[PDB]
């Protein structure tokens, strides 16, 4: 167990890190439609 | 960032910032300061100010000087460069020995241990004092308290502690005085050197120091309780050790916290005491509890102002505590010195599967003829002791016989009494304590038990008082 | 509103210190017997 | 490792949504005033941006006061607070047998997430008038002066108050243990399913009490909430109210069970305190003018419904710690008159060496014959008037002698019955056992033996009687009276078994 | 001593009078003015019959990515930066 | 108008000024008002500064210009004090002249650290039989002296201030202890009486008296134990010994929450502000005893407390009696009783004690604390002997009698020893219990006029040398057998 504990608790830190540098990519324009889409979706449903 | 200081009431200091506001518990650095002054943040008044409780004396302070945010709480060193180091609140020496030389800081405003991370297991400690081993065995890793007013004995029970248990227990150890007297604080520092506990030449010291002495202004009594347990905290967690922390008093820290938080908004609840005691007091004392990762034996003086143990304060530390060992001033004042209370005094390890029946039935022979001593009392008062029964007679004698066996000449009371230290190994505390309960000494004379060790001590003074007759 | 066991001791007041001079006089005065008796014992042991 | 934690991640809910929102203005001492919010229900968890939680307890007409659920060293003065819709609520059912939950209804046991279905208020009103029913079942709480002294039934509120060390817990912990040989066995009328409400106390305390109970093998039907001593303020004003709702699920499923709350003089701290900081006003000791209305809308969750809404139940057992006594003190007089009896514990007899320490001449139950056996009926009566004749005349016990014969004969019939009372820890004895003793004891089968032998004989009888007879005790247990054959045959075998010790 | 106080309120109970509801767009980085004009014209879809929009943007790179916007009350998040903590939070 | 350095005053109301301003004054910095007055910047408030005024304020109105003095609250210290009464700020008020000092020092200054202070080891000697014998008092040591209305406090006060010209006319200079007396909340005619007693026994040659009398507003009243024990910390640091008596203190507290209450700070218990522990701990931990590295110095600190009804279990004498190292419980029944000083053994403590004691005294003094114990245990018998018990009554009356003494007549230490000797070796137990105070004050005139030289012998040596013990028992029993 206290392996796998100890495997597990590092493996999230080490990958969210890694996340953590690579949203400094250049996907600006997806996540900006994906959200003006979101935009529309809850205007819709907000009334 | 940098803010300005705007007010100046007391010891509270409201800052106003432009920059963003520092968290609370940050620590603030007035600057200009011949010393330096730290100031903690503890409220978010609005309108973009704070308000902080400082850890040294407000003179000089000037409506607008700048304040620096160091950006994290009060950080001290730690490691086993902190040892035989006299510390100050924020952890710089008071020693005139130079910097503490370290590669680890804590910040001493961390959380407690989890429930998933406690450790379950208890076994005795043998403190060589025959009250507290036979009435109330003290838990190895367990949180004790001595309760007790002014001038019972605690400072010179815990003295007692540290002598045996200090050098007698291998892993470190950490003495954290919070707002407690200075001469006291040289004493010990003093008595430590010599016993050479801490050395000034080389790196063998085990205890390190911590002094909030009740001249320090109220912020800086009520944080030094955590630096020395951060301190302590360490030698358990990154160590990997068995640490004894002693603190003394602990009732300071409570006191200190009710002096400012009136200037802080707050109305007042119960005795004047603050609103927040019973949390302020949870989260302190949640992280002296032994883990599954290392071992505190936790020893704290608790006052109790005016021997009232129905205080707030006292009565609310009842619940931190396995092992509770009440003094009192009834007792210390017939010369039983310790002056313990043998039936206020308990212990979560006085089960007979953690002690075995040998002891727990000898404890609870000599309280249940306590109590019955007691019972008697009231009538000797109108009878007198001539009219009573003749089985009662019987169990007043082994009463007081009893009271006075529980006394003891501890080492650092070689000055009081002028007696010579003695130890008592458990086992023949139970022995002696057996054989005055079945009657195999109820011939010899009361004052042959007053202040001796083993009982053997006390059939060779029942000798010596019989010549001299 | 009630009372407690061992309190005329507690209270200080006039019995609760003629009770200690009372079961002083007796353990005072037993003490004295005692070590008359256990010099006695000892002394006949001398033979 | 991996293989697993991508089910980690798409086990997730990344929908985002349209809600509402405030901003704190101020912070300290654990009380955020939001300023905003302005659709925020009375008593609504809202939640900070760092993470915490919140309840948002006092709407002012320009901010609301809202007290977070930790430690606020995580917000600041700007801060967003997004509310949620919610009151506050925690999960239920039956997956929580055996668990340790915190006041929210979060494992804090480690040992999995609870994999409950179905969540439930806290703030619920009690039953009213109507679906109650009288308290008619009692509740063997296996220790011998609470079951025949002071009786406990089913639906019943009964006050466990005493000072400091007197074995509060004890009791209550030996009532837990207790119920194991009905849960064990097969009807489902008599399961109890127990619950432990820790407040205030320290995670050591709790945790060897769940090592207690484990041992015991006591945790397949006990739930543990436990707001211990560093939990912020709203957590232990809060789990008393977790424990009854979670109690509420069995009492009104059909089930009884049974809730301990320890201390409740630790919630109404903690809520002095919560009230202090947002400044409403004070009282006497400090406590706000609710310190009543928030125990009582509590303890009277306690029911015993009828067979028209299922026919469950919900006991309980709140511990009050008494500062030396003073009874008259606030809470111990908010809570005693709140309840329905009180079981006085008193140091005095603790030390003497009445274990448990119980104090008869206070203890009273407002139930009384009702919630006793038919079997334990018999024996009790007698018992309690022996008793109490004892009681009025034990001052005299320091001369016995000098004195009539009639009470020398009450006195040796009082000690018998105060030494019977003793009880070990952890030891609790079914009814028909505490029936058996306590028929030796009251009958005269021991008035001719020494006071200091009483509890060998004790000890000896039960195992001499539940090696031998455990017909005998079957006949007495499964109709709970003592028909005239019974009764000879316990006369026997205590004569018989006397005469041979 | 507080009139600025006073106008400043005033001026907020003047706004909501003709109608112009405030908001925010916070985001990842530097944005373009096409952006916004799309901005607007699915913000405005929020709006009352009648209402009008005062957008005050703010270019915030300490968040991640994605956007965080404000309208009136009314606050939705959806920012990289709170995906990837809400992320963390539910598979640890 | 300069509100950098000259505020202007908003309210003045009973003592207490807002002053509109003042943007560069320090916390706790003195102000000059423009009438002569001075007062001291308490509360920075962000608009208005809360300034305490060291007077009354009948002259102050609204529109005066307060201007600051650029330094923290200071008083003038030195030898040039001695023999002066000066007032709480440090103004001569017996009519002497000017005070002329060569030094200030500062009032809320830091008391000395862990390292400084060494252990106690001298005695203080208090000339009172009851104090060196049994509850003796060393110097650096704190020995609060806590009791009712008129129990003889400062009867114990002046008793050591006065004995204290035996060593303050000698050659040494390691024995001499300089003397300062705060005088909180007395009368003017107490304090000029006090003065005038002082006078005749020439003790004010080595005296000051720091006086802040009722009439003097809050402030001063305040304000004189800081200023006191800033006037002995002069000493201590410069390596000579000193000694101050805080008179009472109890009166400090009052005036301090008057100074609070006023300010509008809110109150704690009894109505006292949160602080009043941290008032009078600043102020008694200063109390030191300096190693050889620091001078040597010392300062030995009395403070003297009222308690109202024996109330030990009162706020502030709990405040004061956790702070002290030791007590001496005068009480009122045992005043009455006939014990004069009404000290109560048996409950007066010195937690330093014995290691201050003199050897000479303490081989005596040992001895006589298990006597006078044993027979407090077994003093309640007037409601009733056997032989023990019997000499056990006898010899503690004897001691008891012995304890009794004078008023303001303090007697050397030698002179001491020789009493308790005398009484402790038995050579009393026949005299009726009535004579042993003609006894007492004539072995006293014998042996002060005859054997000089046994007295200057233990005196000199210290302790009881054989010899000496051998002349000693020679002279106490010529002289019962001449008695
Ligand atoms: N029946 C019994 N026999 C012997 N000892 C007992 C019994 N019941 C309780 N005790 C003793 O009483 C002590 C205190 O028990 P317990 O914790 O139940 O009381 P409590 O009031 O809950 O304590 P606290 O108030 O500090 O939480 C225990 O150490 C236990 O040994
Ligand atoms: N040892 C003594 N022998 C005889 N009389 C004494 C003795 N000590 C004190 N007295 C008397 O007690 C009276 C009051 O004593 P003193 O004023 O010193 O005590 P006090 O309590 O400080 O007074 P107050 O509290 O009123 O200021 C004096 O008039 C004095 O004569
Ligand atoms: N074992 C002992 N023997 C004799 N006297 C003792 C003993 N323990 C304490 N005392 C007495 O108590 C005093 C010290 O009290 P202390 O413990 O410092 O007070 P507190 O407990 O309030 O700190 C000493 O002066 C001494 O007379
Ligand atoms: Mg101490
Ligand atoms: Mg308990
Ligand atoms: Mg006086």
Not at chain 2, 53 to 81: F, W, Y
Not at chain 2, 383 to 388: A, F, S, T
Request: hydrophobic share 40%; glycine share 8%.
């Amino acid at each position: 167990n206290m392996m796998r504990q100890k495997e597990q608790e590092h493996m999230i830190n080490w990958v969210e890190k890694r996340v953590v540098q690579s949203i400094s990519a250049q996907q600006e324009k997806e996540t900006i439609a994906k959200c003006i889409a979101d935009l529309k979706l809850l205007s819709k449903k907000a009334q | 960032t940098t803010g300005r200081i705007v007010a100046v009431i007391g010891a509270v200091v409201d800052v106003q910032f432009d920059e963003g506001l520092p968290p609370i518990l940050n620590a603030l650095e007035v600057q200009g300061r011949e010393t330096r002054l730290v100031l903690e943040v503890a409220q978010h008044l609005g309108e973009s100010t704070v308000r902080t409780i400082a850890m040294d004396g407000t003179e000089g302070l000037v409506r607008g000087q700048k304040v620096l945010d160091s950006g994290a709480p009060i950080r001290i060193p730690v490691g086993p460069e902190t040892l035989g180091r006299i510390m100050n609140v924020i952890g710089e020496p008071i020693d005139e020995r130079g910097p503490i030389k370290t590669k680890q800081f804590a910040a001493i405003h961390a959380e407690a241990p989890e429930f998933v991370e406690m450790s379950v297991e208890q076994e005795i400690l043998v403190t060589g004092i025959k009250v507290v081993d036979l009435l109330a065995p003290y838990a190895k890793g367990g949180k004790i308290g001595l309760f007790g007013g002014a001038g019972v004995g605690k400072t010179v029970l815990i003295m007692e502690l540290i002598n045996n248990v200090a050098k007698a227990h291998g892993g470190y150890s950490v003495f954290a005085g919070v707002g407690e007297r200075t001469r006291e604080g040289n004493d010990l520092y003093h008595e430590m050197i010599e016993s050479g506990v801490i050395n000034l030449k080389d790196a063998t010291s085990k205890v390190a120091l911590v002094y909030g002495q009740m001249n320090e202004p109220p912020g800086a009594r009520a944080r030094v309780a955590l630096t020395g347990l951060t301190v302590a905290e360490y030698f358990r967690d990154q160590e990997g050790q068995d640490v004894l922390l002693f603190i003394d008093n602990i009732f300071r820290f409570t006191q200190a916290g009710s002096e400012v938080s009136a200037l802080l908004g707050r109305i007042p609840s119960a005795v004047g005491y603050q609103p927040t005691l019973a949390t302020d007091m949870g989260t302190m004392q949640e992280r002296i509890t032994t883990t599954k990762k290392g071992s505190i034996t936790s020893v704290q003086a608790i006052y109790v102002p005016a021997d009232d143990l129905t205080d707030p304060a006292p009565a609310t530390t009842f619940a931190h505590l396995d092992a509770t060992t009440v003094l009192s001033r009834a007792i210390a004042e017939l010369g039983i010195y310790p002056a313990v209370d043998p039936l206020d005094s308990t212990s979560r390890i006085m089960d007979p599967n953690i002690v075995g029946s040998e002891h727990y039935d000898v404890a609870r022979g000599v309280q249940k003829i306590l109590q019955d001593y007691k019972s008697l009392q009231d009538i000797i008062a109108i009878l007198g002791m001539d009219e009573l029964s003749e089985e009662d007679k019987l169990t007043v004698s082994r009463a007081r016989k009893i009271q006075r066996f529980l006394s003891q000449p501890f080492q650092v009371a070689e000055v009081f009494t002028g007696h010579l230290g003695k130890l008592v190994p458990l086992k023949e505390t139970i022995k002696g304590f057996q054989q005055i309960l079945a009657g195999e000494y109820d011939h010899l004379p009361e004052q042959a038990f007053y202040m001796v060790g083993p009982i053997e001590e006390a059939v060779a003074k029942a000798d010596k008082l019989a010549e001299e007759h | 509103v009630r009372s407690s066991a061992g309190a005329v001791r507690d209270a200080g007041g006039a019995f609760g210190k003629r009770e200690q001079a009372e079961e002083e006089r007796y353990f005072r005065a037993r003490a004295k017997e005692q070590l008359a008796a256990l010099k006695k014992h000892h002394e006949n042991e001398i033979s | 490792v991996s293989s697993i934690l991508e089910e980690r991640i798409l086990g997730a809910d990344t929908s985002v949504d349209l809600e509402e929102t405030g901003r704190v203005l101020s912070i300290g001492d654990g009380i955020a005033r939001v300023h905003g919010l302005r659709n925020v229900q009375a008593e609504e968890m809202v939640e900070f941006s760092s993470g915490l939680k919140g309840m948002s307890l006092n709407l002012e007409p320009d901010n609301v006061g809202v007290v977070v659920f930790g430690n606020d060293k995580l917000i600041k003065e700007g801060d967003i607070v997004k509310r949620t819709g919610a009151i506050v609520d925690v999960p239920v059912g039956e997956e929580l047998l055996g668990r340790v939950v915190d006041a929210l209804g979060n494992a804090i046991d480690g040992k999995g997430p609870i994999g409950s279905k179905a969540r439930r208020r806290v703030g619920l009103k009690a039953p009213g008038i109507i679906p109650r029913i009288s308290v008619r079942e009692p509740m063997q709480t296996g220790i011998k002066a609470v079951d025949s002294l002071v009786p406990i039934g089913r639906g019943q509120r009964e006050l466990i108050i005493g000072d400091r060390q007197t074995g509060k817990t004890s009791i209550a912990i030996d009532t837990i243990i207790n119920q194991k040989r009905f849960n064990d066995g097969t009807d489902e009328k008599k399961k109890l399913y127990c619950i432990y409400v820790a407040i205030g106390q320290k995670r050591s305390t709790v945790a060897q009490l769940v090592k207690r109970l484990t041992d015991a093998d006591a945790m397949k039907y006990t739930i543990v909430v436990s707001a211990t001593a560093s939990d912020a303020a709203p957590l232990q004003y809060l789990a008393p109210y977790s424990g009854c709702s979670m109690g509420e699920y069995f009492r009104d499923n059909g089930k009884h069970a049974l809730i301990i709350y320890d201390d409740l003089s630790k919630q109404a701290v903690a809520y002095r305190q919560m009230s202090l900081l947002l400044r409403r006003p004070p009282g006497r000791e400090a406590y706000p003018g609710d310190v009543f209305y928030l125990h009582s809308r509590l303890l009277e969750r306690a029911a015993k419904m009828n067979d028209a809404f299922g026919g469950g139940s919900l006991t309980a057992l709140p511990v009050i710690e008494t500062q030396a006594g003073d009874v008259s003190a606030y809470i111990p007089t908010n809570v005693i008159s709140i309840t329905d009896g009180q079981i006085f514990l008193e140091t005095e007899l603790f030390y003497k060496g009445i274990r448990p320490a119980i104090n008869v001449g206070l203890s009273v139950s407002r139930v009384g014959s009702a919630a006793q056996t038919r079997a334990m009926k018999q024996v009790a009566g007698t018992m309690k008037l022996e008793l109490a004749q004892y009681r009025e005349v034990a001052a005299f016990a320091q001369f016995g002698s000098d004195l009539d014969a009639a009470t020398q004969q009450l006195l040796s019939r009082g000690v018998r019955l105060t030494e019977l009372l003793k009880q070990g820890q952890y030891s609790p004895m079914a009814i028909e056992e505490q029936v058996a003793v306590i028929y030796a004891g009251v009958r005269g089968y021991l008035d001719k033996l020494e006071p200091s032998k009483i509890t060998k004989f004790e000890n000896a009888f039960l195992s001499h009687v539940i090696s031998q007879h455990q017909a005998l005790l079957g006949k007495i247990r499964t109709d709970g009276k003592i028909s005239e054959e019974s009764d000879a045959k316990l006369k026997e075998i205590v004569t018989n078994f006397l005469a041979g010790f | 001593t507080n009139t600025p106080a006073v106008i400043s309120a005033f001026s907020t109970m003047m706004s909501v009078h003709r109608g112009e509801v405030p908001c925010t767009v916070t985001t990842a980085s530097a944005l373009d003015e096409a952006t916004l004009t799309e901005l607007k014209t699915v913000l405005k879809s929020f709006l009352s019959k009648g209402q009008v929009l005062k957008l005050e943007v703010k270019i915030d790179p300490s968040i991640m990515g994605g956007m965080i916007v404000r309208i009136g009350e009314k606050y939705v998040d959806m920012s990289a930066k709170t995906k990837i903590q809400k992320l963390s939070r539910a598979m640890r």
